[PDB]
Design an enzyme around this catalytic site. Structure first.
Site, PDB file in Angstrom:
ATOM      1  N   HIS A  64      32.730  29.384  36.477  1.00 38.93           N
ATOM      2  CA  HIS A  64      31.764  29.751  35.680  1.00 38.93           C
ATOM      3  C   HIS A  64      30.504  29.961  36.292  1.00 38.93           C
ATOM      4  CE1 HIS A  64      31.206  25.538  34.311  1.00 38.93           C
ATOM      5  NE2 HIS A  64      30.052  25.763  34.422  1.00 38.93           N
ATOM      6  N   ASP A  88      38.900  27.580  36.005  1.00 33.52           N
ATOM      7  CA  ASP A  88      37.568  27.557  36.288  1.00 33.52           C
ATOM      8  C   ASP A  88      37.150  27.032  37.632  1.00 33.52           C
ATOM      9  OD1 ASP A  88      34.910  28.060  35.724  1.00 33.52           O
ATOM     10  OD2 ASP A  88      34.801  26.255  34.639  1.00 33.52           O
ATOM     11  N   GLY A 144      24.186  21.550  35.075  1.00 32.91           N
ATOM     12  CA  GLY A 144      23.688  21.688  36.316  1.00 32.91           C
ATOM     13  C   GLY A 144      24.669  20.848  37.115  1.00 32.91           C
ATOM     14  N   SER A 146      28.072  20.525  36.629  1.00 35.76           N
ATOM     15  CA  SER A 146      29.395  21.170  36.797  1.00 35.76           C
ATOM     16  C   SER A 146      29.618  21.142  38.327  1.00 35.76           C
ATOM     17  CB  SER A 146      29.863  22.252  35.917  1.00 35.76           C
ATOM     18  OG  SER A 146      29.232  23.469  36.960  1.00 35.76           O
TER      19      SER A 146
HETATM   20  C1  LIG Z   1      35.490  27.896  29.348  1.00 33.29           C
HETATM   21  C2  LIG Z   1      34.546  27.620  30.496  1.00 33.29           C
HETATM   22  C3  LIG Z   1      33.870  28.507  30.511  1.00 33.29           C
HETATM   23  N1  LIG Z   1      34.617  29.416  31.542  1.00 33.29           N
HETATM   24  C4  LIG Z   1      34.032  30.597  31.964  1.00 33.29           C
HETATM   25  C5  LIG Z   1      34.323  31.576  32.680  1.00 33.29           C
HETATM   26  C6  LIG Z   1      33.824  32.619  33.006  1.00 33.29           C
HETATM   27  C7  LIG Z   1      32.429  32.665  32.841  1.00 33.29           C
HETATM   28  O1  LIG Z   1      31.713  33.901  33.235  1.00 33.29           O
HETATM   29  C8  LIG Z   1      30.393  33.680  33.820  1.00 33.29           C
HETATM   30  C9  LIG Z   1      31.625  31.762  32.062  1.00 33.29           C
HETATM   31  C10 LIG Z   1      32.396  30.570  31.622  1.00 33.29           C
HETATM   32  N2  LIG Z   1      31.828  29.672  30.822  1.00 33.29           N
HETATM   33  C11 LIG Z   1      32.460  28.802  30.579  1.00 33.29           C
HETATM   34  O2  LIG Z   1      31.877  27.899  29.770  1.00 33.29           O
HETATM   35  C12 LIG Z   1      30.613  27.471  29.719  1.00 33.29           C
HETATM   36  C13 LIG Z   1      29.946  26.529  30.996  1.00 33.29           C
HETATM   37  C14 LIG Z   1      30.092  25.574  30.784  1.00 33.29           C
HETATM   38  C15 LIG Z   1      29.460  24.418  31.150  1.00 33.29           C
HETATM   39  O3  LIG Z   1      28.120  24.267  30.542  1.00 33.29           O
HETATM   40  N3  LIG Z   1      29.738  23.588  31.784  1.00 33.29           N
HETATM   41  C16 LIG Z   1      28.907  22.404  32.371  1.00 33.29           C
HETATM   42  C17 LIG Z   1      27.813  22.811  33.263  1.00 33.29           C
HETATM   43  O4  LIG Z   1      26.837  22.071  33.847  1.00 33.29           O
HETATM   44  N4  LIG Z   1      27.753  23.990  33.563  1.00 33.29           N
HETATM   45  S1  LIG Z   1      26.556  24.563  34.751  1.00 33.29           S
HETATM   46  O5  LIG Z   1      25.415  24.559  33.792  1.00 33.29           O
HETATM   47  O6  LIG Z   1      26.303  23.751  36.030  1.00 33.29           O
HETATM   48  C18 LIG Z   1      26.780  26.460  35.017  1.00 33.29           C
HETATM   49  C19 LIG Z   1      25.778  26.662  36.192  1.00 33.29           C
HETATM   50  C20 LIG Z   1      27.341  26.717  36.401  1.00 33.29           C
HETATM   51  C21 LIG Z   1      29.482  21.124  32.833  1.00 33.29           C
HETATM   52  C22 LIG Z   1      28.730  21.359  31.604  1.00 33.29           C
HETATM   53  C23 LIG Z   1      27.302  20.758  31.280  1.00 33.29           C
HETATM   54  C24 LIG Z   1      26.750  20.443  29.968  1.00 33.29           C
HETATM   55  N5  LIG Z   1      30.465  25.071  29.131  1.00 33.29           N
HETATM   56  C25 LIG Z   1      30.605  24.068  28.572  1.00 33.29           C
HETATM   57  O7  LIG Z   1      30.802  22.900  29.216  1.00 33.29           O
HETATM   58  C26 LIG Z   1      30.711  24.249  26.912  1.00 33.29           C
HETATM   59  N6  LIG Z   1      31.709  23.174  26.697  1.00 33.29           N
HETATM   60  C27 LIG Z   1      33.022  23.476  26.470  1.00 33.29           C
HETATM   61  O8  LIG Z   1      33.445  24.666  26.615  1.00 33.29           O
HETATM   62  O9  LIG Z   1      34.124  22.677  26.031  1.00 33.29           O
HETATM   63  C28 LIG Z   1      35.368  23.102  25.686  1.00 33.29           C
HETATM   64  C29 LIG Z   1      35.910  23.747  26.951  1.00 33.29           C
HETATM   65  C30 LIG Z   1      36.221  21.894  25.368  1.00 33.29           C
HETATM   66  C31 LIG Z   1      35.315  24.038  24.482  1.00 33.29           C
HETATM   67  C32 LIG Z   1      29.447  23.599  26.343  1.00 33.29           C
HETATM   68  C33 LIG Z   1      28.377  24.645  26.521  1.00 33.29           C
HETATM   69  C34 LIG Z   1      29.630  23.760  24.808  1.00 33.29           C
HETATM   70  C35 LIG Z   1      29.036  22.319  26.884  1.00 33.29           C
HETATM   71  C36 LIG Z   1      30.279  26.390  28.416  1.00 33.29           C
END
Ligand SMILES: CCc1nc2ccc(OC)cc2nc1O[C@@H]1C[C@@H](C(=O)N[C@]2(C(=O)NS(=O)(=O)C3CC3)C[C@H]2CC)N(C(=O)[C@@H](NC(=O)OC(C)(C)C)C(C)(C)C)C1
Ligand SMILES: [Zn+2]
Length: 187
Positions: A64, A88, A144, A146
Site C-alpha cells: 500500500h 500487502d 508512517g 508500516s
Molecule cells: C488493507 C490494507 C491496505 N491495502 C492497500 C492496498 C493497496 C492500496 O493502494 C494504494 C492501498 C491499501 N491500503 C490499505 O490500508 C490502508 C493503509 C494502512 C495503514 O495506514 N497502515 C499503516 C501505515 O502507517 N501506513 S503508512 O501511513 O506508512 C502508508 C504510506 C504507506 C500501519 C498503519 C499506521 C496507522 N491502513 C490501516 O492500517 C487501517 N487499518 C486497517 O485497515 O485495519 C484492518 C485491516 C484490520 C481493517 C487504518 C487506516 C484504519 C489504520 C489503511
C-alpha cells in the site's frame, strides 16, 4: 517513479539523509549513490513516507506504500523481487550496507514495534499476525511506521508492521506480516 531511501533507523535512533528536493530528484532519477546503514530504512515515494526492513538479505515493506515501484540504488533503479498483493507485501534485494534482522525463534509474546521516530512500542503477541498494544495510540501517531519491524526482547524480527486495528480513530492493536510468511514468499 522510484521509492527513495530518505533515512534510516539504527538499533533505537532514527536519522534522515535526504530531503524533499533530494527525494523529489532521486524518486525521479532512481540513482542514489548514498551510503546505506541500519536495519530499518525510512523510505519515501513522492506522495508517501513509511518504513522498510531488511530480512534474509531482502528489504521488505508494504504494497500500500510501494505499489510496484522500483527502488533507487547507486547503479540505478532496482525492480522488485517479490510482490504479493494479498499480503500487502513487496520486497527488493537488500541494498549494500543494510544489515538484515535475524528472525525470531524465541517464541516470545513480548514484542516491541519501532516507529519512524525510532520510538519502541510494547506489544503483546495475540497470535500469528496480531499484536495488542499495551497503550492504545492515535492513528496518525503510527502513520508512517508500516514496513517497520516488530522485535522480540532479544532484538530478533517477529514481523513487519502492516495495518493498525482501530476503533473510533484509536489503534488498539497492530497487524503484521510474520517473518514465516516472508519465508513462505521466498519459499
Ligand atoms: C488493507 C490494507 C491496505 N491495502 C492497500 C492496498 C493497496 C492500496 O493502494 C494504494 C492501498 C491499501 N491500503 C490499505 O490500508 C490502508 C493503509 C494502512 C495503514 O495506514 N497502515 C499503516 C501505515 O502507517 N501506513 S503508512 O501511513 O506508512 C502508508 C504510506 C504507506 C500501519 C498503519 C499506521 C496507522 N491502513 C490501516 O492500517 C487501517 N487499518 C486497517 O485497515 O485495519 C484492518 C485491516 C484490520 C481493517 C487504518 C487506516 C484504519 C489504520 C489503511
Ligand atoms: Zn527471538
Amino acid at each position: 517513479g522510484s521509492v527513495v531511501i530518505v533515512g534510516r533507523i539504527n538499533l533505537a535512533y532514527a536519522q534522515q539523509t535526504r530531503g524533499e528536493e533530494g527525494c523529489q530528484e532521486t524518486s525521479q532519477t532512481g540513482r542514489d549513490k548514498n551510503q546505506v546503514e541500519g536495519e530499518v530504512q525510512i523510505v519515501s515515494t513522492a506522495t508517501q513516507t513509511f518504513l522498510a526492513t531488511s530480512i534474509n538479505g531482502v528489504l521488505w515493506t508494504v504494497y500500500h506504500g510501494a505499489g510496484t515501484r522500483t527502488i533507487a540504488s547507486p547503479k540505478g533503479p532496482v525492480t522488485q523481487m517479490y510482490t504479493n498483493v494479498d499480503k500487502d507485501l513487496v520486497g527488493w534485494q537488500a541494498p549494500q550496507g543494510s544489515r538484515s534482522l535475524t528472525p525470531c525463534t524465541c517464541g516470545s509474546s513480548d514484542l516491541y514495534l519501532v516507529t519512524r521516530h525510532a520510538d519502541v512500542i510494547p506489544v503483546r503477541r495475540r497470535g500469528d499476525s496480531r499484536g495488542s498494544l499495551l497503550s492504545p495510540r492515535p492513528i496518525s501517531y503510527l502513520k508512517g511506521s508500516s514496513g517497520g519491524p516488530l522485535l522480540c526482547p532479544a532484538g530478533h524480527a517477529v514481523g513487519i508492521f502492516r495495518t493498525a486495528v482501530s476503533t473510533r480513530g484509536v489503534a488498539k492493536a497492530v497487524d503484521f506480516i510474520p517473518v514465516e510468511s516472508l519465508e513462505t514468499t521466498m519459499r
